[PDB]
Structure 1
Amino acid sequence: SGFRKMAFPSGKVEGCMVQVTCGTTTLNGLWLDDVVYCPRHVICTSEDMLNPNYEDLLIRKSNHNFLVQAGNVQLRVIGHSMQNCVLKLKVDTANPKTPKYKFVRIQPGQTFSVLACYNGSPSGVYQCAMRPNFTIKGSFLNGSCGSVGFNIDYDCVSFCYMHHMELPTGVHAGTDLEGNFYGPFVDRQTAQAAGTDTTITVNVLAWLYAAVINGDRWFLNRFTTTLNDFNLVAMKYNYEPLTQDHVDILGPLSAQTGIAVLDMCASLKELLQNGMNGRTILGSALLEDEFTPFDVVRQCSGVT
């Protein structure tokens, strides 16, 4: 019973958080095995940030300039290298709390949990989605850079995001753990406007299936539609076009509820065209798009 915006248990990630200081800048690092991963802008001063030449800035840095602290103990830095927009600090000690892990570059529409950190210490955990415009709508303040996004499959943590910056519009941009930004964003204090933040249609349908499973059914109607007819409505409302891959991914939810994907699309079509009329769905007065079909199945089945 019930449906919540649920994050993964953060323990395995908390054991990887460290504090990295270079000069006067302190941010978060991720310690996995004998490597600490952190945003390369840790080497920048506020003045450098307008147009930084990271290769030139990094020349003036030695291993001893990178202060890495895990809890209250200091890690010895024996190597440093820049991989895209991340720094990799080789330390002399493997993290004893290193979980089984992978680095994954997620697709827009996919969700993940963020462990927001400051000075290497966890402050909280929440669930995010990579927006179709490659931004994330997070909760981060100065000092949160280096906080990571991740998913967990039983005992394996798949790291997918590392926080780097806030855009002037209050949305967030970052990289995968290879240091490549999601989207066109660059790690410099410059005019970087975000593209259209469209709604993740397959996720809204998954959340509608979750609502039916949990008893909220008022929005079910007597109608059906086609992918092409639905997509005309989706375009008008800045929803992502629905494909047969999306319909296929909703198959288990359609099978569990007995509601054909195209019938659910027709409920969504009427919801887009007529609104909620002051009503709610799973305690929300808008269509929620940050639950994937996998999230709905996981939460509705209790995968640990």
Structure 2
Amino acid sequence: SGFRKMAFPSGKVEGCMVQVTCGTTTLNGLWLDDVVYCPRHVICTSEDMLNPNYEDLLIRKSNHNFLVQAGNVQLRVIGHSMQNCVLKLKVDTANPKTPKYKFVRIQPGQTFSVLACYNGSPSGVYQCAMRPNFTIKGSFLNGSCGSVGFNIDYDCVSFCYMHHMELPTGVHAGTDLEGNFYGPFVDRQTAQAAGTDTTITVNVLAWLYAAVINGDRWFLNRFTTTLNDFNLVAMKYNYEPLTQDHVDILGPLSAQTGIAVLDMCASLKELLQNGMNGRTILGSALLEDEFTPFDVVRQCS
């Protein structure tokens, strides 16, 4: 038992991290087979920050303007193309540490591990969720651009995030590994701000199910609710709407605990009204929204 914010083992991603340099700009790249993926803004200079013309800046580069370093080895760039906001450097060596991998674009509420890297070297690993406003609450200093987010369900590494920038409110924005941003953001230093954030309702319920599995029942009540009445109350606390999809997804946790999803929704309504009265759930004094139903079942008995 016990319940912890738990990341995937990072070894399969550590073997893929490299340094990419262009002009005076150094950031992280991701080395899979014979390709290195990195944010295209590596090719920008001081004035290219506001309104860069990427197609114009790239056409002015040759393969030999890109310095790629895997530890001590200098990889040789033989090819370069752009896909959306991601630059792809072909190299003469395929990475011998390349794992089974795939690229997936996740939805708001999904969780992944982040391997924070500086100068192509890993610094640490932690768990994040894609917020409903398409940002992540990360830990990223200058030089962390090119750091990736991933899941490792069953020895295959699914890459879902590459880090591009920090927005003025201290939250983080990036792309899938095909270079398409999550949310309405662009790789320009023009004024940008995230939408108002909301609490991931389905994840809060999954964590309440986790608390019950780990033998906590103090927050339950004899009440139930309609899905509609639940959504009318929840949205008054900036909670995401709960859909029939979300209800279906909680089915197995419902079955294991014998508490119906709409009975647990009644428990959540009460917690939102009363708070915790000096108690904690699974070690938190807040309702936690960065554990998915899949996360809860993976970690729990």
TM range (shorter): over 0.9
Q: Provide the rounded CA distance (Å) in 2 between the counterparts of 1:207 and 1:70.
A: 40
> How far is the alpha carbon of 1:190 from its aligned partner?
1.6
- Gaps (5+ residues) in structure 1? none
TM-score with structure 1 length normalisation?
0.98
> How far is the alpha carbon of 1:215 from its aligned partner?
2.0
> Is the partner of 1:12 in helix, strand or coil?
helix
Q: Provide the rounded CA distance (Å) in 2 between the counterparts of 1:177 and 1:69.
A: 20
> Is the partner of 1:276 in helix, strand or coil?
coil
> How far is the alpha carbon of 1:277 from its aligned partner?
1.8
Q: Provide the rounded CA distance (Å) in 2 between the counterparts of 1:23 and 1:132.
A: 36
> How far is the alpha carbon of 1:216 from its aligned partner?
2.2
Q: Deviations over 1:192-224 (max 9, x none)?
A: 111021111000000000011112221111111
> Is the partner of 2:117 in helix, strand or coil?
strand
Q: Provide the rounded CA distance (Å) in 2 between the counterparts of 1:143 and 1:45.
A: 15
Deviates more, 1:214-223 or 1:204-213: 214-223
Q: Provide the rounded CA distance (Å) in 1 between the counterparts of 2:123 and 2:296.
A: 26
> Is the partner of 1:272 in helix, strand or coil?
helix
Q: Deviations over 1:239-278 (max 9, x none)?
A: 1111111111001111111111111000000011111122
- Gaps (5+ residues) in structure 2? none
Q: Provide the rounded CA distance (Å) in 2 between the counterparts of 1:259 and 1:99.
A: 40
Tell whether 2:33 aligns with 1:33. Answer: yes
> How far is the alpha carbon of 1:157 from its aligned partner?
0.4
Q: Provide the rounded CA distance (Å) in 2 between the counterparts of 1:216 and 1:124.
A: 32
> Is the partner of 1:271 in helix, strand or coil?
helix
> Is the partner of 1:220 in helix, strand or coil?
coil
> Is the partner of 1:203 in helix, strand or coil?
helix
Structure 1 segments (4+ residues) deviating >2 Å: none
Q: Provide the rounded CA distance (Å) in 2 between the counterparts of 1:202 and 1:245.
A: 10
Aligned to 1:209: 209
Q: Deviations over 1:10-37 (max 9, x none)?
A: 0100010010001100000000010000
> How far is the alpha carbon of 1:46 from its aligned partner?
3.1
Q: Provide the rounded CA distance (Å) in 2 between the counterparts of 1:254 and 1:122.
A: 39
Figure out how many residues of one structure are paired with residues of the other and give that number. Answer: 301
Q: Deviations over 1:54-107 (max 9, x none)?
A: 111112211001111111111010000010000000001111000001000000
Aligned to 2:88: 88
TM-score with structure 2 length normalisation?
0.99
Q: Provide the rounded CA distance (Å) in 2 between the counterparts of 1:154 and 1:72.
A: 31
> Is the partner of 1:245 in helix, strand or coil?
helix
Aligned residues: CA RMSD:
0.8
Q: Provide the rounded CA distance (Å) in 2 between the counterparts of 1:216 and 1:190.
A: 48
Tell whether 2:122 aligns with 1:106. Answer: no
Aligned to 1:56: 56
Q: Provide the rounded CA distance (Å) in 2 between the counterparts of 1:84 and 1:126.
A: 27
> Is the partner of 2:160 in helix, strand or coil?
strand
> Is the partner of 1:126 in helix, strand or coil?
strand
> How far is the alpha carbon of 1:118 from its aligned partner?
0.4
> Is the partner of 2:300 in helix, strand or coil?
helix
Q: Provide the rounded CA distance (Å) in 2 between the counterparts of 1:23 and 1:217.
A: 59
